[PDB]
Amino acid sequence: LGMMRHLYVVVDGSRTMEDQDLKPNRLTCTLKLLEYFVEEYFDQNPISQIGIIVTKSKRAEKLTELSGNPRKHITSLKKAVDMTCHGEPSLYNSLSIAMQTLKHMPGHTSREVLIIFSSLTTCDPSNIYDLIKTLKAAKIRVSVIGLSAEVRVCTVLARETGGTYHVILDESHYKELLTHHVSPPPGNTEPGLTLGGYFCPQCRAKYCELPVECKICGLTLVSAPHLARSYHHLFPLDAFQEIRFCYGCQGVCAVCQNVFCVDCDVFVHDSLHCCPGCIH
Amino acid sequence: MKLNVDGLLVYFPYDYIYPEQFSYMRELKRTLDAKGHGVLEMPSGTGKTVSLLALIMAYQRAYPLEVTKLIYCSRTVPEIEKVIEELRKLLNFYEKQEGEKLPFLGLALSSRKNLCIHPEVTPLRFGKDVDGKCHSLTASYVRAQYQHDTSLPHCRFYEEFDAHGREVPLPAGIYNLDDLKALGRRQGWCPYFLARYSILHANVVVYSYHYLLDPKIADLVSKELARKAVVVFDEAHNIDNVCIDSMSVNLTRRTLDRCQGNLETLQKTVLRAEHFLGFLRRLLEYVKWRLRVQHVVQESPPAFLSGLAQRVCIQRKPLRFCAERLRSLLHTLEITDLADFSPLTLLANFATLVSTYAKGFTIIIEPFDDRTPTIANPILHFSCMDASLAIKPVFERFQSVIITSGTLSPLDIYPKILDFHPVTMATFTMTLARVCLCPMIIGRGNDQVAISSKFETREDIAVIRNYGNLLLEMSAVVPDGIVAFFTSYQYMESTVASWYEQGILENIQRNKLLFIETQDGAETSVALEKYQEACENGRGAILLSVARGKVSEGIDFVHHYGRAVIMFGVPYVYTQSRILKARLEYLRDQFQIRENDFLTFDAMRHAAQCVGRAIRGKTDYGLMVFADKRFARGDKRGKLPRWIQEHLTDANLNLTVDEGVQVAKYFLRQMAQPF
DNA sequence: GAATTCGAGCTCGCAACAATGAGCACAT
DNA sequence: ACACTGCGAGCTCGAATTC
Ligand code: SF4
Ligand SMILES: [Zn+2]
Ligand SMILES: [Zn+2]
């Protein structure tokens, strides 16, 4: 179904991130829904990555490098709750940091940038309209979730590179907009599985209980039960036809001719995802 | 789309009509069948132009004997080219619906500086020079030696035009200004004189105001054209100021000493008729003697003509033909250029205006200048008061004349100033899928201090801070462009400088760049192209200007250029000038218009024109604040038109500065979302 | 059955009203 | 030969409980 995604999340750190009409700090409501967003992203996407960049005082600083750690992002967003948020942000600098290290991903992925933008002004030392010609060349899909207004350059950035642009009604609308980005849009990597509690198979580098890549030899270490949940869409199971004694619950499949019931026909197709007579 | 108005089959060139726009054609048909005038009002610029042209062009098919010609008077040359391009879009729609051709031609007229092919005369900058360099190449004494066909100076385009451009007319194909030059190029004819010759046999004709309102022009281009026509005065909210400036001459010392040089150089040529030179040398002495006084200002509109016969003994009977013989004396003298004799024609036009037109005129000699007790620069104004002495030929010659704009502020002032009786006098209002405009009257400040731009409430810092605290707190919630009209140049300069001495202008420059519109044209067009570029990228800009300026009347702020339009006070004229203080005397005796009710009407038509320059389209949304306490009263907010008054509620009527932002921020959040 | 408390609406009298700036298109 | 738009006064109701 979906493909791999290397999604940066750009967070605004302007002076206007101390504004009301949210949770009483505008930055800490953004960081609250983002920690929910990182958790929901890695569950509908097994082998993807997340980077988080912030912008403050005409400069961009990479808060977290592009790595598929579903814990190292949440413990860094909890650290940056008390950020000072002085100055106006930049959009040329943030899409240059998110392009100097997103240009070098392989071509069979879906590289993306999600800009959460609260300020209205992007004071930047160069022209923006050559980045959008460059981002369209590098197949980067930039989507913006705006706050309180609609900037013109954020619609040109969204519709030319290929993303979307939406503006917040309230906090309930903000959580609904982030849940549209967890779904993936419709090459062979080398991972190593992690038998023995959680060790490394390539260089015996023991570390904690994570699906993160190896910090020494550079091999991605995933858990094979996590990839197993995303099966049963490929070669899926078919429906049945219906016209006492059952086969599943013991009290009609057209493959192996095994009679089911109404409480089993709702359970095999929805939750079990495999015919109990076909396994024999 | 075979749309049906109450008697016609109107071919509309679109698919969706707006329910107010169909009712515009019913009231427009109600004028033409009644053979009378009409004062209509509908906001937009396009959509109004394509609906008016759809009915009248379809009206002359069902009744081809009642109306024959449509004269469309627009403001200037950019809107002349816009109306013609909306006409061929309707014509090509007729070419698909019927599959035929039509005996239907439509022109566009402008000055000789626009229709010009000859290379040595086109790159002249000023408009009054291209007439002279033409007149040195095409006058009847210049072509007098061209009957021998020698190598004397001549225009090849004019001399080719009268030999072949008479037997065949223009066939079809609605012409722009550029299309007429392209037709004149590939055929070899004049573009200017082909447009003037073929204006008598046309169906739609689009020129400016001054071919019909100016009395010394309309007897040359539009005297014998049509006795059964339809005139449309598009965007004619300031139609009275065009009618006053056309019949008003202004004389000063700088002009009069140049007439002495023209009278000097005419005396060297007669020796190489003579009673006419002693006539003008007599008249130039008297007008200089009247400007020689240093006394109180005085007015005497027919008593000038008595004192002109006392010391100088010149009667008024030869004075009526003063400008006539000077046009004939320069013909028999065969002068090359005529832009040099422009002061002497201006003195001769003054002489033929004080002899005939004296019912509602005045002559104001002002030795005491503006604000200074002794500066040697006196000036006499020959100011017209009655604005209905310029449409009285237009209201009588034609069949029906339709005065339409978007901001006719009360509909009953216009038939009172202009002496006529309409048959509809209707208004309209746009219908929308949202509420695309949120007007508000930001009154008292953030600490319950009045905000008004009066004359005694301008130098106190409790108001200048509340103007600075407003533009600061609106430049953080409005995206990509704010137009802030001030009331004058000396008030815009004395407030930005008083924001810089305080700590307010440094906090606006953090959000948005600020560009200032100045009087000169080079620095304005530079500061206007960096404004429209700073709204396209993410910086966001502020264009703070004046209200009776060039940007407020010419530049059309489309969406995301000027989301907010901030009026920094009611834009009054100088209410103590001696010209305006005499015009309100005529407006109080005649027509009984109260002198306070005219200054508000004049101001609410400039405060609604530039505010209404922020919405042009279906998807355009726009904030429009009115940062003055005086806007809140009944005789001022009841004057702004019915398409920006139907959304001005009573909650948004005396809003403070901080509460005006949370109506600004809530409106811009609602508009940013899809339909 | 005839008061109250606090609300609503419509008539109408009362007292005192305001109004400050700057330039190019069109005829022989 | 002065005086615009706002605004508390009487007047008379209402709902529900009192005296
Ligand atoms: S006569 Fe024709 S070519 Fe000559 S100046 Fe006039 S418009 Fe131009
Ligand atoms: Zn390893
Ligand atoms: Zn069963």
Ligand SMILES: [Zn+2]
């Ligand atoms: Zn089976």
